[PDB]
Amino acid sequence: PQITLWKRPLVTIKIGGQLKEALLDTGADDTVIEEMSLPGRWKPKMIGGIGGFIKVRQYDQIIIEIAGHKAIGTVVVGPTPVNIIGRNLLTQIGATLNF
Amino acid sequence: PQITLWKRPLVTIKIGGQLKEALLDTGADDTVIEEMSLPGRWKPKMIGGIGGFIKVRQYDQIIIEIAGHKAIGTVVVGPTPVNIIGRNLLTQIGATLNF
Numbered sequence: 593p594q595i596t597l598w599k600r601p602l603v604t605i606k607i608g609g610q611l612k613e614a615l616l617d618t619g620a621d622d623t624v625i626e627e628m629s630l631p632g633r634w635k636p637k638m639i640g641g642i643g644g645f646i647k648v649r650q651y652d653q654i655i656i657e658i659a660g661h662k663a664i665g666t667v668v669v670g671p672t673p674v675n676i677i678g679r680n681l682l683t684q685i686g687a688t689l690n691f
Numbered sequence: 692p693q694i695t696l697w698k699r700p701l702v703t704i705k706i707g708g709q710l711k712e713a714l715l716d717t718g719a720d721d722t723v724i725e726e727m728s729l730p731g732r733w734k735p736k737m738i739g740g741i742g743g744f745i746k747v748r749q750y751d752q753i754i755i756e757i758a759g760h761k762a763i764g765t766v767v768v769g770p771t772p773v774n775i776i777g778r779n780l781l782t783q784i785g786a787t788l789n790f
């Protein structure tokens with residue numbers, strides 16, 4: 593698909609057996625999901641953005657289906673107001689910015 | 692151009708006659724620039740991100756070149772860690788996300 597940016601580039605994802613809405617975010621290093629349980633081990637991390645940092649739990653080798661495209665990678669979980677698909681998974685579905 | 696996302700999508704911008712580095716950010720509603728002087732009056736705005744909110748100065752109808760493409764629109768100035776080109780100006784340069 594080609595997505596114009598007049599509005600927020602929101603898509604449906606599947607993660608942990610759950611459907612969620614998420615933002616396709618070229619300005620994010622990481623994939624940050626609102627609080628949910630995920631399988632396997634995790635470790636704590638601090639991630640920063642405008643405003644400062646938040647504490648998250650980092651889970652590795654997590655599969656997410658992103659608007660129909662499967663990708664695997666590290667997902668961090670914590671108190672974000674918006675689920676964001678960052679570059680670590682955007683690369684895996686072949687996403688590019690074009691102008 | 693076609694910009695992949697293995698690295699941060701950083702480009703050169705020109706604002707106020709000055710060259711700066713900025714991030715092309717589909718996740719950002721607004722364009723946020725590091726402290727600098729800009730002409731005219733400003734109005735207040737609060738912008739929210741991952742760690743919370745920051746106060747910025749909103750300047751309308753600012754001329755800015757982005758990777759060689761001219762945009763004229765709203766920029767907010769404040770204590771951002773990274774200059775961010777958000778959707779308000781990405782649309783003016785005709786940017787799309789594709790996968």
Ligand SMILES: CC(C)(C)NC(=O)[C@@H]1C[C@@H]2CCCC[C@@H]2CN1C[C@@H](O)[C@H](Cc1ccccc1)NC(=O)[C@H](CC(N)=O)NC(=O)c1ccc2ccccc2n1
Pocket residue numbers: 617618619620621622623624639640641642672673674676678714716717718719720721722723738739740741772773775777
């Ligand atoms: C810029 C503004 C207009 C305020 N918009 C936003 O911040 C919205 C807010 C939304 C609600 C909260 C959840 C995030 C979404 C998406 N974001 C956009 C989104 O693209 C945002 C833009 C950004 C990039 C760089 C630095 C700061 C801010 N990115 C991020 O928040 C990601 C989160 C992450 N760690 O992966 N940060 C970074 O990728 C990142 C990179 C370099 C940095 C250097 C110093 C300090 C912080 C740094 N953060």
Ligand SMILES: [Cl-]
Pocket residue numbers: 664665666680681
């Ligand atoms: Cl990863």
